[PDB]
Write an enzyme that holds these catalytic residues in place. Structure first.
Site, mmCIF file in Angstrom:
data_model
loop_
_atom_site.group_PDB
_atom_site.id
_atom_site.type_symbol
_atom_site.label_atom_id
_atom_site.label_comp_id
_atom_site.label_asym_id
_atom_site.label_seq_id
_atom_site.Cartn_x
_atom_site.Cartn_y
_atom_site.Cartn_z
ATOM 1 N N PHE B 83 62.706 19.484 9.024
ATOM 2 C CA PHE B 83 62.106 18.495 9.911
ATOM 3 C C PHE B 83 62.450 18.835 11.352
ATOM 4 O O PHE B 83 63.583 19.222 11.638
ATOM 5 C CB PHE B 83 62.569 17.086 9.544
ATOM 6 C CG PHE B 83 62.161 16.029 10.536
ATOM 7 C CD1 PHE B 83 60.956 15.358 10.400
ATOM 8 C CD2 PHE B 83 62.994 15.691 11.595
ATOM 9 C CE1 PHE B 83 60.578 14.388 11.318
ATOM 10 C CE2 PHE B 83 62.618 14.717 12.516
ATOM 11 C CZ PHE B 83 61.412 14.072 12.370
ATOM 12 N N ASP B 87 56.721 17.516 18.599
ATOM 13 C CA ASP B 87 55.700 18.578 18.709
ATOM 14 C C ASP B 87 55.377 18.810 20.172
ATOM 15 O O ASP B 87 55.551 17.896 20.979
ATOM 16 C CB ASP B 87 54.446 18.346 17.824
ATOM 17 C CG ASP B 87 53.586 17.159 18.178
ATOM 18 O OD1 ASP B 87 52.863 17.234 19.198
ATOM 19 O OD2 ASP B 87 53.591 16.168 17.401
ATOM 20 N N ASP B 128 45.745 29.534 14.458
ATOM 21 C CA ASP B 128 45.699 28.106 14.814
ATOM 22 C C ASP B 128 46.891 27.738 15.702
ATOM 23 O O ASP B 128 47.645 26.811 15.413
ATOM 24 C CB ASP B 128 45.527 27.166 13.584
ATOM 25 C CG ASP B 128 45.050 25.747 13.897
ATOM 26 O OD1 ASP B 128 44.070 25.599 14.667
ATOM 27 O OD2 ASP B 128 45.621 24.788 13.322
ATOM 28 N N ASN B 133 50.834 22.303 16.744
ATOM 29 C CA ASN B 133 51.430 23.159 15.724
ATOM 30 C C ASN B 133 52.720 23.835 16.190
ATOM 31 O O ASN B 133 53.363 24.531 15.409
ATOM 32 C CB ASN B 133 50.415 24.177 15.205
ATOM 33 C CG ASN B 133 49.309 23.542 14.407
ATOM 34 O OD1 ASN B 133 49.396 22.384 13.961
ATOM 35 N ND2 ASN B 133 48.208 24.257 14.268
HETATM 36 C C1 LIG Z 1 56.261 21.762 8.960
HETATM 37 C C2 LIG Z 1 56.122 20.280 8.906
HETATM 38 C C3 LIG Z 1 56.730 19.567 10.090
HETATM 39 C C4 LIG Z 1 58.081 19.492 10.454
HETATM 40 N N1 LIG Z 1 58.281 18.780 11.554
HETATM 41 N N2 LIG Z 1 57.018 18.381 11.935
HETATM 42 C C5 LIG Z 1 56.640 17.659 13.039
HETATM 43 N N3 LIG Z 1 57.642 17.175 13.819
HETATM 44 C C6 LIG Z 1 57.441 16.414 15.031
HETATM 45 C C7 LIG Z 1 57.535 14.952 14.800
HETATM 46 C C8 LIG Z 1 58.261 14.390 13.826
HETATM 47 C C9 LIG Z 1 58.226 12.994 13.585
HETATM 48 C C10 LIG Z 1 57.439 12.191 14.332
HETATM 49 N N4 LIG Z 1 56.644 12.659 15.313
HETATM 50 O O1 LIG Z 1 55.278 12.337 15.045
HETATM 51 C C11 LIG Z 1 56.701 14.076 15.704
HETATM 52 C C12 LIG Z 1 55.290 17.467 13.266
HETATM 53 C C13 LIG Z 1 54.340 17.994 12.352
HETATM 54 N N5 LIG Z 1 52.968 17.968 12.555
HETATM 55 C C14 LIG Z 1 52.415 17.398 13.795
HETATM 56 C C15 LIG Z 1 51.317 16.393 13.487
HETATM 57 C C16 LIG Z 1 50.284 16.983 12.532
HETATM 58 C C17 LIG Z 1 50.936 17.503 11.249
HETATM 59 C C18 LIG Z 1 52.035 18.517 11.548
HETATM 60 C C19 LIG Z 1 51.456 19.889 11.909
HETATM 61 C C20 LIG Z 1 52.480 20.983 12.113
HETATM 62 O O2 LIG Z 1 53.065 21.392 10.877
HETATM 63 N N6 LIG Z 1 54.743 18.640 11.268
HETATM 64 C C21 LIG Z 1 56.057 18.845 11.069
#
Ligand SMILES: CCc1cnn2c(NCc3ccc[n+](O)c3)cc(N3CCCC[C@H]3CCO)nc12
Lengths: 270, 298
Positions: B83, B87, B128, B133
């Site tokens: 985690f 982003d 992408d 991301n």
């Molecule tokens: C690999 C999976 C992962 C791990 N951390 N994380 C975060 N962390 C940031 C965060 C955490 C908690 C609340 N806020 O919203 C920001 C965001 C995110 N993503 C952004 C949104 C769309 C899906 C996804 C795409 C990119 O894998 N995916 C992940």
């Protein structure tokens, strides 16, 4: 180290990651020495059957070799397998391969239809997860045909060492491929690295010198493999090399990359 | 099968599935779960999932997200990742009025160019690279995430999917319908994210494929056969395109120094064959402070 100087990375680094990958992707020639009810000619007929479905569905030689690698590697994880399970394991290995490599893979039904009812989409959907879970999701190997691609590119490279734009003759590619397709049918090929098998087939169509230039391997590295491929090479040479087929909806700049099928088993008998 | 995880918050969607922040009940360890509903899937496990899993299980680098495990609950497939607290899209937005400090831009870009150099050497195209991301932590690290649209490339490459990068970060070679594309497409995206970090506004915020090209053409100047050997011959190239001149990079990205402007320029070269590489970009004077070279053999 046969790759020229690389823009995006160290040509030595790229080639060594490629090499080190064959060390992390293990395949064993004595896998049916785990499955006593199974015979090596069963693998050959299935592998032959998958090449045919591939041609029928105009699939890439890459997706066929991914299915072969998936099949031979999944078996090394299984203990006792019955002759009847094979159609299922083969087409599911092809179902995973098609999805990984194709832009518009054939649908699940198209894979079920080609088994003539012996396999339902649901068994393919279950098997696919058993194969993938059992392979431990290690589904990115450097296939036998992947190496010939490299080798063929390094042969047709000028002072402007553009390693990624494809520049090589299609007819020569097909004729080397056909030999590899014929050796893939015998389960003994797995004693030789995929890089070695591809180099050795290239050698039978060229020389030791071109082989070393495009692949990097010395003749000593290839000697036992060339020795084993010797009958297969002659069965092909005795018959006379095949011609570059055209495929509807497939651009001719990629016709060489479409999997094809012949009397490979009749030739294998020798 | 997910008996030890407690879903805490929904993070978003991404390329495929749904991302939830979850907590390991015993460990105290916080993960990000990407859940796929197999019950809905007609073709079973999507190709996007199969690619992300197999590609990342071979991509271990500090500037690339860590896939921790894959769990199947006879209806669902969960990808358990490390985690990351924020982003880059949320961060640039929060910093829109303030501005990201130039040293933090340089750090982020450098680490981003390292994760990419690793991908590219392992023959993986991200396809992408957008701020949503690129995931940051509290310690100053940035990591490449969402490999759902990524693909492993051959040496040589062959024709790949056309409908491939997020419009605003799409390379002109994809837009102008070139049959082959490679590593250069990711550097274009990074070039855009770099300037967007500097200016706090998208470099090329187009509303169509044609507007995207024109926005690029207005800034970088309409390309020709001298700047790009092959343009006029390319499929989607029209000789009727308006002829614009390249704008001064002093106006385009004002807070950026001579060394910053040079790197950005080479990152946004029209010719994929001339566009800087991730590894080369690491050796640019813009980072000559943050990095010291290593001896070269032979
Ligand atoms: C690999 C999976 C992962 C791990 N951390 N994380 C975060 N962390 C940031 C965060 C955490 C908690 C609340 N806020 O919203 C920001 C965001 C995110 N993503 C952004 C949104 C769309 C899906 C996804 C795409 C990119 O894998 N995916 C992940």
């Amino acid at each position: 180290s046969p790759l020229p100087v690389l823009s995006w990375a160290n040509r030595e680094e790229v080639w060594k990651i490629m090499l080190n990958k064959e060390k992390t992707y293990l395949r064993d020639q004595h896998f049916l020495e785990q499955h006593p009810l199974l015979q090596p000619k069963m693998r050959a007929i299935l592998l032959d059957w998958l090449m045919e479905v591939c041609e029928v569905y105009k699939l890439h030689r890459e997706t066929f070799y991914l299915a072969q690698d998936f099949f031979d590697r999944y078996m090394a994880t299984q203990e006792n397998v019955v002759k009847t399970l094979l159609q299922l394991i083969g087409i599911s290995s092809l179902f995973i391969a098609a999805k990984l490599e194709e832009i518009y893979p054939p649908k699940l039904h198209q894979f079920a239809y080609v088994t003539d009812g012996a396999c339902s989409g649901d068994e393919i959907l279950t098997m696919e997860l058993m194969i993938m879970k059992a392979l431990k999701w290690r589904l990115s190997p450097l296939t036998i045909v992947s190496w010939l691609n490299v080798y063929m590119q390094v042969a047709y490279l000028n002072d402007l060492h553009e390693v990624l734009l494809p520049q090589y003759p299609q007819q020569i590619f097909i004729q080397i491929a056909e030999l590899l397709d014929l050796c893939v049918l015998d389960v003994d090929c797995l004693e030789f690295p995929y890089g070695i098998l591809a180099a050795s087939a290239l050698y039978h169509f060229s020389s030791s010198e071109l082989m070393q230039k495009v692949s990097g391997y010395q003749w000593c590295d290839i000697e036992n493999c060339v020795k084993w491929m010797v009958p297969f090479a002659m069965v092909i040479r005795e018959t006379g090399s095949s011609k570059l087929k055209h495929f509807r909806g497939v651009a001719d700049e990629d016709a060489h990359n479409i999997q094809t099928h012949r009397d490979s088993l009749d030739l294998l008998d020798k | 099968s997910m008996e030890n995880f407690q879903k805490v918050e929904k993070i978003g969607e991404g390329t495929y599935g749904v991302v939830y922040k979850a907590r390991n009940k015993l460990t105290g360890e916080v993960v990000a779960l990407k859940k796929i509903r197999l019950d809905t899937e007609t073709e079973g496990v999507p190709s996007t999932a199969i690619r992300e899993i197999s590609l990342l299980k071979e991509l271990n680098h500090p500037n690339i997200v860590k896939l921790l495990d894959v769990i199947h609950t006879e209806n669902k497939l969960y990808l358990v990742f490390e985690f990351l607290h924020q982003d880059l899209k949320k961060f640039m937005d929060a910093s829109a009025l303030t501005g990201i400090p130039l040293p933090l831009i340089k750090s982020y870009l450098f680490q981003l160019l390292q994760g990419l150099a690793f991908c590219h050497s392992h023959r993986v195209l991200h396809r992408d690279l957008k701020p949503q991301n690129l995931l940051i932590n509290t310690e100053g690290a940035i990591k490449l995430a969402d490999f759902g649209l990524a693909r492993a490339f051959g040496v040589p490459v062959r024709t790949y999917t056309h409908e491939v990068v997020t419009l605003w970060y799409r390379a002109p070679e994809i837009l102008l319908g070139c049959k082959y594309y490679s590593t250069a497409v990711d550097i274009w995206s990074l070039g855009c994210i770099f300037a967007e970090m500097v200016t706090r506004r998208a470099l090329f915020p187009g509303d169509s494929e044609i507007d995207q090209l024109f926005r690029i053409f207005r800034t970088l100047g309409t390309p020709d056969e001298v700047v790009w050997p092959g343009v006029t011959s390319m499929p989607d190239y029209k000789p009727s395109f308006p002829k614009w001149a390249r704008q001064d990079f002093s106006k385009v990205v004002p807070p950026l120094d001579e060394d910053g402007r040079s790197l950005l320029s080479q990152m946004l070269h029209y010719d994929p064959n001339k566009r800087i590489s991730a590894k080369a970009a690491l050796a640019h004077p813009f980072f000559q402070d943050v990095t010291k070279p290593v001896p070269h053999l032979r």
